[PDB]
Write a protein that holds these residues in place. Structure first.
Motif, short mmCIF file in Angstrom:
data_model
loop_
_atom_site.label_atom_id
_atom_site.label_comp_id
_atom_site.label_asym_id
_atom_site.label_seq_id
_atom_site.Cartn_x
_atom_site.Cartn_y
_atom_site.Cartn_z
N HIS A 10 40.08 -9.05 -20.19
CA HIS A 10 40.98 -10.19 -20.02
C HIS A 10 41.03 -10.95 -21.35
O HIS A 10 40.13 -11.73 -21.66
N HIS A 12 42.46 -13.75 -23.40
CA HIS A 12 43.13 -15.04 -23.25
C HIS A 12 43.06 -15.79 -24.58
O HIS A 12 41.98 -16.12 -25.07
N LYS A 75 47.11 -12.62 -21.17
CA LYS A 75 47.58 -13.95 -20.75
C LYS A 75 47.26 -14.81 -21.98
O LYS A 75 46.35 -14.47 -22.72
N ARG A 81 47.11 -11.84 -28.81
CA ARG A 81 48.29 -11.14 -28.29
C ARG A 81 48.88 -10.09 -29.24
O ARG A 81 49.71 -9.28 -28.83
N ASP A 100 50.48 -7.39 -18.98
CA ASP A 100 50.79 -8.78 -19.29
C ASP A 100 50.92 -9.42 -17.91
O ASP A 100 52.03 -9.72 -17.45
N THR A 102 50.86 -12.30 -16.13
CA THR A 102 51.00 -13.74 -16.26
C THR A 102 51.55 -14.42 -14.99
O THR A 102 52.77 -14.41 -14.75
N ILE A 104 52.66 -17.09 -14.05
CA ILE A 104 53.25 -18.32 -14.57
C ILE A 104 53.53 -19.37 -13.50
O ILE A 104 54.02 -19.06 -12.42
N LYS C 17 57.43 -7.48 -23.26
CA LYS C 17 56.71 -8.71 -22.94
C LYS C 17 57.39 -9.80 -23.77
O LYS C 17 57.73 -10.86 -23.24
N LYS C 22 57.42 -14.52 -23.23
CA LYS C 22 56.32 -14.67 -24.18
C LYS C 22 56.12 -16.15 -24.48
O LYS C 22 55.34 -16.84 -23.82
#
Lengths: 116, 151, 65, 49
Positions: A10, A12, A75, A81, A100, A102, A104, C17, C22
């Motif tokens: 993971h 981050h 994330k 990234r 990915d 995410t 959100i 992505k 992003k």
RNA sequence: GUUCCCGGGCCUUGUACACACCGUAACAAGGUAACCGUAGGGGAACCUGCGGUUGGAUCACCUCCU
RNA sequence: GCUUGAGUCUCGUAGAGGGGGGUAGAAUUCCAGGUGUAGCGGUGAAAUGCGUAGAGAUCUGGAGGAAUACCGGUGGCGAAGGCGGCCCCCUGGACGAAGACUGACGCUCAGGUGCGAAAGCGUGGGGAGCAAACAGGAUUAGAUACCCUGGUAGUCCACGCCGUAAACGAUGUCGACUUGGAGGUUGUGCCCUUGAGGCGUGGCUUCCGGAGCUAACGCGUUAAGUCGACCGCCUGGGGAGUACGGCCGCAAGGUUAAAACUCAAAUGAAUUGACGGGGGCCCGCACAAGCGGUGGAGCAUGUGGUUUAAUUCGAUGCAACGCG
């Protein structure tokens, strides 16, 4: 230990920090690596080179476990990234798939605040 | 200076060999404008270096030139704002403008004997890979590989 | 979101992505709300969005350079 | 296949499209000489080298 | 070779300036954009939160697809 | 009495329009459990705090609380303010094809009535996030100021009170009239909606322009163009859109709204310079690559200072110092 092959890393990347936490699909963590836990205090943690050193500190502490077809659950599109997922694909890993994931928010709660 | 895309001019070739590599080395080895006084010294030097090397007065200069001629000269040409050197492959005309510059800086150091002999030493040293001449060429090459990620 | 590709990569490939958002929702849920801000900056943005089309209308009639 | 070397791709039609007027006759594309005339005459466009 | 550095010119953007660049809050983006309305507070300018508007500034570079 | 004005019905659409309640899902603070590390956080930098009493990080279950990324469009609704999931009920306003009518039933205002973002407060509940007063560490000569960690008030649901604004496309309102283009948004009538359309008509809104107005910028069928009807405001700035009084309020104040005195301007649009740690291009050995020097040394020359009976005066950043 754990007899795991699916090392879920993971990654981050907040803003000034790249904290990667390798775990299991169940959640059984294996440990971590950080752009700030290796040094580079300052705008240096903000660099993906520190995130590169990060992906290497994460490339280790798994030679006792044995992750091979790993999943990259990203994330936090901050400092990392980029030269972090690429560092794993350059550290000798056969990534089955880079994710990915995410979840959100619809901005339900109110977030912090920065640069004014 | 902002416009020049001009190459190299003309020099008088050496009054012995058809090599102008040697012809440039004399204009660089001379001082206070005295080229006659300087040219006769290159002759009394080129002989004894070739004499202590193992071949003739022309190949004992070209084969002894490859050990003192780089390929890279790193220059300051930036794209962002950081301070880094860019490995710059240099033109073939300046490559000699690197070799026959340090060999001259060799003929002015090392207090041995006559100029024709101290030079006869440093290029004979280059003929066997040793001395200060070939030494600085090694150092520039080391300046290249350490900066070869910035492309 | 999820890139895989069984074998012809030799690369990470996270291009969809970035082609998703992003920084799209990063820039929107990372700092203070301030409800009115986007509205004003989309204002200067919109007028300059019509400006390039005004430049498209500025290149078609003359330019006898 | 050029308009500057020969002629209008279409009847009174410039290469770049500066002249999409079938009224425009004679006036060339000032970039490259495209004298607008009927493209059908390009069955008689004689050039050289 | 013009991307580094000193000086110069042209075009351009900007000004409550043209007498002409105890604390900086406005005028260059004044390196924290401005003002009105409201509550409160501090030697004091003003600041913090909430709502609105333009009587505000550049959209120029560095990495990728035709 | 008659109709081009106002208005309603038959037949329909769309919508961050409002209102009461309920619900779905993610994220966040925090709680329990398995794994696990010595750092997390933050800034130009440091630091408060947490940490072997195991934080941050990961997976599962979950209770408060406020708010709806992507659909999002100088788009939509409305008197205005203001307002972004979904459902059930209620419902105002705007618009259109084809007919039926009373027959100008139309417009607006002092006193008056109603709406009123956000905030202050009273009251039955609440507090995840942010965060007035304030505390710690720093920038600093100083901090009650940019920053971070905490934190009372507030924020929210329901009833009311003082009843305020850049409540501003700064453009009062009903209406008629005045060459077009790119459009966007929502309906409708006609022709084969074969088809992504062609020809007209209304509402809202944005840019470039003619008529015309104007100080100018520009507005330009939504007007600042042309008229009629109704109301408020101004007579240079400051004083001041403030004290006090009528009326009102538990508190903070609010509405109507001055004077003495002094100054001789206050203000707006629009331009060329001065400066810019704003952008682009170009020139000179500015720089890149090399050669020789001053400064360490010797001779000649010069200035300031010092001293002397006197050691002329001048220049005294670059442009004074082999200059007179």
């Amino acid at each position: 230990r754990k007899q795991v092959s699916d090392g879920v890393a993971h990654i981050h990347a907040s803003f000034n920090n790249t904290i990667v936490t390798i775990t299991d699909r169940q959640g059984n963590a294996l440990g971590w690596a950080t752009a700030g836990g290796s040094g580079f205090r300052g705008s240096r943690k903000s660099t993906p080179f520190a995130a590169q050193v990060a992906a290497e500190r994460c490339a280790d502490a798994v030679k006792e476990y044995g992750i091979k077809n790993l999943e990259v659950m990203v994330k936090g599109p901050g400092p990392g990234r980029e030269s972090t997922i690429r560092a794993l694909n350059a550290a000798g890993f056969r990534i089955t798939n880079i994710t990915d994931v995410t979840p959100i928010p619809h901005n339900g709660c109110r977030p912090p605040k920065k640069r004014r | 200076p902002r416009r020049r895309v001009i190459g190299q001019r003309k020099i008088l070739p050496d009054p012995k060999f058809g090599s102008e590599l040697l012809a440039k080395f004399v204009n660089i080895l001379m001082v206070d404008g005295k080229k006659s006084t300087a040219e006769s010294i290159v002759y009394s030097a080129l002989e004894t270096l070739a004499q202590r090397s193992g071949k003739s007065e022309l190949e004992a200069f070209e084969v002894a030139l490859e050990n003192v001629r780089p390929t890279v000269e790193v220059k300051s040409r930036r794209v962002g704002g950081s301070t880094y050197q860019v490995p710059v492959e240099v033109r073939p005309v300046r490559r000699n403008a690197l070799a026959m510059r340090w060999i001259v800086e060799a003929a002015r150091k090392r207090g041995d004997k006559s100029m024709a002999l101290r030079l006869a030493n440093e290029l004979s040293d280059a003929a066997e890979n040793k001395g200060t001449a070939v030494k600085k060429r090694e150092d520039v090459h080391r300046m290249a590989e350490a900066n070869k990620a910035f492309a | 979101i999820k890139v895989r590709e069984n074998e012809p990569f030799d690369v990470a490939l996270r291009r969809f992505k970035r082609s998703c958002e992003k920084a799209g929702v990063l820039a929107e849920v990372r700092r203070r709300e301030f409800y009115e801000k986007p509205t004003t900056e989309r204002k200067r943005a919109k007028a300059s969005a019509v400006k390039r089309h005004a430049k498209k209308l500025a290149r078609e009639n003359a330019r006898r350079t | 296949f050029c308009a500057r070397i020969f002629g209008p791709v279409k009847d009174y039609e410039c290469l770049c499209g500066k002249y999409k007027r079938l009224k425009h006759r004679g006036v060339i594309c000032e970039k490259c000489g495209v004298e607008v005339t009927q493209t059908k005459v390009r069955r008689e466009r004689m050039g050289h080298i």
